[PDB]
Design a protein around this ligand. Structure first.
Ligand SMILES: [Ca+2]
Ligand SMILES: [Ca+2]
Ligand SMILES: [Ca+2]
Ligand SMILES: [Ca+2]
Ligand SMILES: [Mn+2]
Ligand SMILES: [Mn+2]
Ligand SMILES: [Mn+2]
Ligand SMILES: [Mn+2]
Lengths: 237, 237, 237, 237
C-alpha cells in the first residue's frame, strides 16, 4: 500500500533480514532490506545530525550522519525517485523500539524542496525548519506514539516520566503540507533534509532506529511495524 | 466567526462603506472598513507586485504595491497581531467581483514566517514560493471560484473561456499548512508575503479587488461576501 | 570621517557620556551617546543572542537581545538610514575593553539584506551565515585585535592563552563584500542580523561591550577608541 | 596559473579544439576542451536559464540549460572539486566574441554555497542574488569589457550604442567576496548557481559563448582569451 523511500539510522543489527553486524545507515526503497548501507559508529547518548540530499538531474539519494568530534558515515544510492514516488508526497521521521529500546528524540528538523521550471525565474519552493517543537504543533501529523513539547523536543517513541525508553513503541511525525516533488515542466527538482537526534538507551543493545522517509501523502504506520520494521514497513520483504 | 487581518488592493470605491473615491490599498483588521488606506494608481491590465511585512517587535503591518516603471503606494498600520489573531493561522489570497468585474489573477506568491526563540539558534521557519500553479495544487486549499493551472496561474475569481471576467464571483486560496505566528518563548516573530497579480477588466470601473489575508485556520468564505466584501467579511460593519 | 550606525551591547555604565547606571543595549546613530537605550540584564559567562532588524518602509531600527531562560531586552529607534548611510556600506561587529575587561567572543553571525525593486520579481539579496570561523576567514576583514579560529570562534578583543581577557583591546570584523542598502528603483529594502556572543569577565565590572555596526565601506578603527568608545567612535561627542 | 572549473554555454563549434559540430554546453576542468558536452539547441534572441549544482558527497558537477517552451539540455561530470580548486575561490561569469559575435547579456545571477560542519547546527552559508545590476555594482569585480547598468543588465562583452555586439571582446564579472568551498570539519559542502542570459547575434553563426566559472580568488582574464577561449583559458590545450 504505502510507497516508502527512507534513509534509516538502524541501531540494531537484524542480520536475518539483511542488516550488517553493526549499527548502520541505509537507503530503503520500498523494503526494510536496504539497497545500500554503510557502518555507522553510533554514539549512545550523543546528539547526532543527519543530512539527506537528492536532485532529479543526478538521481542519487545521499545521506551523511555525524556526531561532533567524530568522522561521518555517508551512504548514497542511484535511484530515480520519479520512478518510485508519486509527484505529491509527505516527508517525515519515523522510529521504533521492540524488545530492545532507546529514546528516539528529534531536537530539530529542516527540509527544503525546490522545483525549478523551464520558464525564466519559475521556482516553486517549500522550506520548513523546526528548532523547537511545541505541545500543539499543528503543522505536524503525529502518528503512533510520537509526541512534541517534551523539553521542546519531538519524542518519536514512548519515553516514561523518568526519561526511560519503552519497548515496542513506534511513532512518526510528517510535515502537514504535501510536497510537490515532480512537475512536468520542471528542469530540476531537489530536496535537502537535516535533523539532529539523540538516541540514548540504558542498554548495551539499543534498538531499533530512526528513519527520515518520503511517502504517499496518506501514509500511516503499518500494523506490526514496531521493532525492526521502523514503523515504515508491514513486513521484512 | 472568522478573525481576519487583510491587506486589500481595492479597485472599486464603495464610498458608502468608507472607501475613498479612488482605488486604494488598505489594512483591514476584522472589518472591511480599513483602518488605514492609501491611494493606489491601479493599472488595468498590468502585472503589479504587493509586498506585505510585519514583525512582533515593531508591531506594524506595512504593505507596498508597485507596477513596473511607476511609483509605489505604501500603507502601514500599528497593530499588535498577537492581540488580534490566534497563535496558529492560515494565510491566503482572496478576491471578488460583484456587478462590476475584473480578472483577479495571481501569477506568483511567496511567504516566509520566522519565530526566533530565546534559546541560542532556535529559529522555526516556514517559507513557500509559488511561481507557477498546477491544476492539482495539493498544498493550497481553494475555496469558492478559485482555480489553478489556467496558464499556470491562480485565478481567484471566475473567468470564462474567452478570458472574460465574470461578475458576482468570489474565490480564496490558502496555504495548506497552519502557520505558527506566536509562541511563548519567541523573542521575535515576523512574516513577509509577496505576490504578483494581474487585474484586467473590459470595463472602465473594475471591481472589487484582491486581498492578502491571515485568518483562523478554519476560515471559509462568509455567505454573501462577493463584491465589496472581498470574500473576507460577512457584512460591511 | 566614518558614518556609523550601531546597536551596542554596552556592559559598562559610563554615566558621564550619557550611559544609564546599568548594562544596556542602545542604538547609536553617529555618536556613542545612544539615541535610545534599554536596560540589559547582562549575564556574565552566558551565551546571548542579538537580533537586529530594519526595513526602509517603517524606517525603524530594532534590536532584541536574549539569554536562554531569561526575558529579552529590546530597543527601537525611528530613523531613516537612507538619510544617514551611503547606499553601499559594510556591516560588522566591534568590541573593546579599557581598564575593565571581558572576552568579546562571537560564536555565530548571520546577516540578510534584500532590496526589492519595482520590476516584477526583481529581488537583489545578500545572505551570509557563519556558525564557525576558521583561522583564515578570507571573507572577513579583521581590524585591530580581532582574531578567528580560536575554538572556531571570532575573538573580537585580545584574550591571552589562559582564556583571560586583556584590557585596552579593540577589534572589529567586517564582511568582505559591500552591501547595497538603497537603490533608486527599490520599493523596499530590509536587513536582519543575528549574532550570538559570550561575554565573560573575571571581574565584577566587565567592560566595554560589543556592537553590531553598519558603516561607510572603508571604515577603520578610530584612533583611541578602546574602552568606552567601542572601536566605533573617535570621541564621545 | 589560474585554476578554472567552468560550465560553458559554447555557441560556436570550434571542431579543431574538440568542440562538437553544434552549440553545446560542456564542463571544463582546467582546459577549454570540455570533459563532457551535450548538444544545446541554442536560441538566438531568447532568454535562457542555466542551473549549475554540485555537492561534495556525490562529487558530480551538473548543469541544466533551458529556454521557455523548450526541452532542456543537461550535462554532468564526476569530479571531486576539492582535488581541483583551492578551498577559497571566486565564482563568476565570463564571455567572449572573436571574429563571430553575439551579445552576452546576463539578466540575473544567484549563487548559494553551504558548508555543513560536524558540530550540531554548524552551517556556514553564502547566498547572493542579482535580478538587476546597477552601474556601480560594488560587490562585483568586472574584468575586461564587462559593464553593468545598461538596462539593469550585465553586458559581459561589448555592445555598441545601437545594441550591436562587437567582435573580439572578452569580459568577466566575479562576486566580490571569496567563497569557502572546503573546510576540514565540513561533512557536506554544496553550491547551486543559476543565471539567465540573452545571447543575440545579427549573424547566423554567433560566437563564442558564456561560461559560469569558479577559480582561484585572484583570477584575471588570460591574455588572448577572446573568441574560442571564453576569457577563461590562455590556450587551447
Ligand atoms: Ca535493524
Ligand atoms: Ca471597495
Ligand atoms: Ca559604556
Ligand atoms: Ca567554441
Ligand atoms: Mn538496517
Ligand atoms: Mn476599501
Ligand atoms: Mn552606552
Ligand atoms: Mn566547447
Amino acid at each position: 500500500a504505502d510507497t516508502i523511500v527512507a534513509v534509516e539510522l538502524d541501531t540494531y543489527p537484524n542480520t536475518d533480514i539483511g542488516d550488517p553486524s553493526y549499527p548502520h545507515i541505509g537507503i530503503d526503497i520500498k523494503s526494510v532490506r536496504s539497497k545500500k548501507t554503510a557502518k555507522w559508529n553510533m554514539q549512545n547518548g550523543k546528539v547526532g545530525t543527519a543530512h539527506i540530499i537528492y536532485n532529479s538531474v543526478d538521481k542519487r539519494l545521499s545521506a551523511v550522519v555525524s556526531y561532533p568530534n567524530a568522522d561521518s558515515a555517508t551512504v548514497s544510492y542511484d535511484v530515480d525517485l520519479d520512478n518510485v514516488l508519486p509527484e505529491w508526497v509527505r516527508v517525515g521521521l519515523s522510529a521504533s523500539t521492540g524488545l530492545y529500546k532507546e529514546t528516539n528524540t528529534i531536537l530539530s528538523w529542516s527540509f527544503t524542496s525546490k522545483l525549478k521550471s523551464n520558464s525564466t525565474h519559475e521556482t516553486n519552493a517549500l522550506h520548513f525548519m523546526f528548532n523547537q517543537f511545541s505541545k500543539d504543533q499543528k503543522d505536524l501529523i503525529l502518528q503512533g506514539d510520537a509526541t512534541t513539547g517534551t523539553d521542546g523536543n519531538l519524542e518519536l517513541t514512548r519515553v516514561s516520566s523518568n526519561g526511560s525508553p519503552q519497548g515496542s513503541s513506534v511513532g512518526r511525525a510528517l510535515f502537514y503540507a504535501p510536497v510537490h516533488i515532480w512537475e512536468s515542466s520542471a528542469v530540476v527538482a531537489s530536496f535537502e533534509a537535516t535533523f539532529t537526534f539523540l538516541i540514548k538507551s540504558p542498554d548495551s543493545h539499543p534498538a531499533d532506529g530512526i528513519a527520515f522517509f518520503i511517502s504517499n501523502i496518506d501514509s500511516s504506520i503499518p500494523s506490526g511495524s514496531t521493532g525492526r520494521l521502523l514503523g515504515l514497513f508491514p513486513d521484512a520483504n
